[PDB]
Amino acid sequence: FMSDITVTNWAGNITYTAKELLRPHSLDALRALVADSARVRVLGSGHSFNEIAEPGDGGVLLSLAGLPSVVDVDTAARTVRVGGGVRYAELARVVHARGLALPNMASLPHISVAGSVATGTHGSGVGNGSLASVVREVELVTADGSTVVIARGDERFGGAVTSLGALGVVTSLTLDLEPAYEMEQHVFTELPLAGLDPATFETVMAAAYSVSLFTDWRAPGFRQVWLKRRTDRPLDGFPYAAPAAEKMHPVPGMPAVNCTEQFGVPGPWHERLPHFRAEFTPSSGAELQSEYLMPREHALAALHAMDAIRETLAPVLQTCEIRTVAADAQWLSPAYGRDTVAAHFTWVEDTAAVLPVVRRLEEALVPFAARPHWGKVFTVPAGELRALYPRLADFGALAGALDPAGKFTNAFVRGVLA
Ligand SMILES: *Cc1cc2c(cc1C)nc1c(=O)[nH]c(=O)nc-1n2C[C@H](O)[C@H](O)[C@H](O)COP(=O)(O)OP(=O)(O)OC[C@H]1O[C@@H](n2cnc3c(N)ncnc32)[C@H](O)[C@@H]1O
Ligand SMILES: [Cl-]
């Protein structure tokens, strides 16, 4: 019963030093565990790919999986209060049943809400903010066990959602909602990079509510284009690529059964925004991930820099996805303060082969002020990375106020706060 266990992230490339995952079964127990522990980090659903959740030797790794997962919709207010450990699939089910909806979702819905917003998680669409952008309040258990609630409008709130877990344990969050809406997903194949000029790139990325491009970086250009269209908005002809003949997966050869419905068949928002259907429930994945988030005005130059090194990228690549994100108010969001283009890479799970490719990719993106996704694999040096965040000092002051001893600062966060 008392024997050591091995605790990893979802993809299993990160093995934590913790020999047990503590899952307190009450908020009283959680407060006491936090107060009594010298160093703490929280594990959500483990869909990070780096050391962000590692608390160091002797540090406590705790989870909310032992507490009830509550999803409380106020229909008149159009809000939902959720536990930090609740995952997006359940959140979406419950809000949809109340006739309400989120403005966006990530690719796969089986990810914790608190952990998603902690790192900058986003979907696509030129007018759609990050997942954090709909949070209007957070509730934290701080280092001494006490609760601090921070709401939108509080001078601190810009640092309180996407915080890398550095302020305390987020026990609940409240999100804003909109009326439930219908969508259609239309997939296309073969979009050239040649002739993808500023006007055409803008037209393509704005052609639906959320648009992704996918490529293998093998033949020139893009292999797929996914349009996720609201039925309450117009859909113009899309002459730029061929209509897909078959149901598609982002990664060529992987099972398209896993993916949300295509061929433009209408269905609800939460069955169209993700790329992966709720029924698809993988307990791990044999992959790594990286993503770089740049000013949207650099999209073409960045795509052209990556095209020039395509032969270096391709051998370790499962798929690359290009997305857009609206400017974020959160100080540590990779989309902070600027409309954004994102370049995501799902790699083969071969750390030794991937890291040198990541380093070369990062070099290629330096001219475009690329910020890495905090949840994913990156090798940007700490000082260089700190220089990319205008309000980093403000964040550090907030962390110092709420957590003076740095109970929630691990090695990952320490390099951000240095
Ligand atoms: C696995 C995965 C991830 C993923 C994705 C697809 C898959 C298969 N698609 C994404 C996408 O479309 N867009 C996007 O921007 N990200 C996508 N991701 C990445 C993923 O969403 C993030 O890496 C996310 O942060 C993972 O959250 P999760 O909860 O699974 O991961 P974690 O390692 O356990 O924790 C991450 C950080 O959050 C802190 N955390 C977690 N819970 C809390 C609470 N309650 N309070 C304070 N912090 C918390 C962790 O400590 C860690 O720092
Ligand atoms: Cl091309």
Swiss-Prot record:
GO cellular component, one term: membrane
Gene Ontology terms for molecular function: D-arabinono-1,4-lactone oxidase activity; FAD binding; L-gulono-1,4-lactone dehydrogenase activity; xylitol oxidase activity
Cofactor(s) the protein needs: FAD
Short name of one Pfam family: ALO
Name of the protein in question: Alditol oxidase
Co-factor remark: Binds 1 FAD covalently per subunit.
Residues holding FAD: 42-48, 107, 112, 115, 119-122, 170, 323, 373
Family named by the database record: Belongs to the oxygen-dependent FAD-linked oxidoreductase family.
Gene: xyoA
